[PDB]
Amino acid sequence: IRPLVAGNWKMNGKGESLTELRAIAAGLSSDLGRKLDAVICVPATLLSRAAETLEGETVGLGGQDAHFKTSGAHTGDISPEMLKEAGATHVILGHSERRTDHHESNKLICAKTEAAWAAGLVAIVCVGETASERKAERALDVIGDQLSGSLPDGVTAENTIIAYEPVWAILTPTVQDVRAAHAFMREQLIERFGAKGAHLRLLYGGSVKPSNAAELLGVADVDGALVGGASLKAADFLAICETYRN
Amino acid sequence: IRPLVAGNWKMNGKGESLTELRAIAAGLSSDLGRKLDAVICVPATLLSRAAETLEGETVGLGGQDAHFKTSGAHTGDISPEMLKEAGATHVILGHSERRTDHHESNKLICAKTEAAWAAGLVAIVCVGETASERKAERALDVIGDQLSGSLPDGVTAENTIIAYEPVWAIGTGLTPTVQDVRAAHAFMREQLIERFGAKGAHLRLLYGGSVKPSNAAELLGVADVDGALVGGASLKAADFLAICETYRN
């Protein structure tokens, strides 16, 4: 499985930040970048400008959310077609921050996931359990439910990526923690999707930094990362990518 | 009070839509645009390109929502500074679609309005009662609670515009009467004067119900209506402009 390092800028980044994007492009201009895929998910306000900056580079662009409809009376909401037409190849769906603060349900994320595929986008679908779900020993129940409710029947290794977010630690998770969450995801996805389940990229979406990337990304059934803060600066992001030097 | 026709594209608009902004700008190059302000509120994905499209022109640009913080861990949210830096001068906040479908409270909208101001944006803050609240005989009580709860203490006549949405009418095929509009706007004016004094007398109060080339003259002649927040009819330049032509004098 080819690795993917995806950056989630969350609600950071304006015109000035585009330099970081260029530097990431530059850093992956060589042998390193030929070895992995990389996608940076920027705010919707920055996407077209970022698409221009990245024209002819290996680095892909994501949005951080999209609606389930193509268009309509939905003030303030962005369609996946809009993301597509502005230059996105990917969109993050079901991020913990939206499941929690925006109350997004598994059903909604499923509908967003189909609509994303219909617009030509790869869905980066996030799952993850809270501290109390974990303290209550329901971690796997919850991850399992999120995966079976958030993912539509038509998943392929090409149209869907899964990111695991240990929301519970928002504590640092152990290698052991990461290992057991990702083995569980892999077995869940194979049970439901068979062959292609084995090919779906599972990204680790906990706290990923240059200093912990080697240990976390060397874990079985981790196929990359959904990097938060460390993706805002090209030097951090590139040092995380350095992991796949070999 | 100088009138403002604002257009709300809602979740409509891509690169191909930019010619419409262009046509609107050109229609308002006449003697017309000297008399009124115009703002089109476009999807955040289009904002920077729409900014580029309208460079130099009188037509302002709006966002359709914005966060209450400047930045941070809010995956998929847009801060009012991102709108500002992309070229917007305005942002719609508290639209009924967001109050209903995104469960936005007065408290959230208040927090969003402060942040909009701190980013250098004029907040277009929407209020409006449902058919249920109307049948409860609480129309005015609802609009009053929304205005008091949604608006921060720092309102100025320059940093805030209010738009009234007759949400009750949506989906019914009936359009509010001049009597309905007058009563809502007279009420909003009195409330804003009680709370903000003379600032409250100069606040622009936009009519955000169904406004189309066919009804614009009557509705926009209503006392205490200082313009409109136009929906569907802002999607096509000729419709938007025919609403604006109501103000030719």
Automatic annotation (TrEMBL), chain B:
One of its GO terms (cellular component) is cytosol. It comes from the Bacteria. The gene is tpiA. This is Triosephosphate isomerase. The keyword Glycosyltransferase does not apply. GO terms for molecular function: triose-phosphate isomerase activity. InterPro entries: Aldolase_TIM, TIM_sf, TrioseP_Isoase_bac/euk, Triosephosphate_isomerase, Triosephosphate_isomerase_AS. Pathway: Carbohydrate degradation; glycolysis; D-glyceraldehyde 3-phosphate from glycerone phosphate: step 1/1; Carbohydrate biosynthesis; gluconeogenesis; Carbohydrate metabolism; erythritol degradation. NCBIfam families: tim (TIGR00419). PROSITE patterns: TIM_1, TIM_2. It is found in: Cytoplasm. Substrate binds at N8, W9, K10, G171, S210, G231, G232. The active site is at H95, E165. Keywords: Cytoplasm, Gluconeogenesis, Glycolysis, Isomerase. It is an enzyme of class 5 (isomerase). Its EC number is 5.3.1.1. Belongs to the triosephosphate isomerase family. It catalyses: L-erythrulose 1-phosphate = D-erythrulose 4-phosphate; D-glyceraldehyde 3-phosphate = dihydroxyacetone phosphate. Homodimer. Involved in the gluconeogenesis. Catalyzes stereospecifically the conversion of dihydroxyacetone phosphate (DHAP) to D-glyceraldehyde-3-phosphate (G3P). One of its GO terms (biological process) is glyceraldehyde-3-phosphate biosynthetic process.
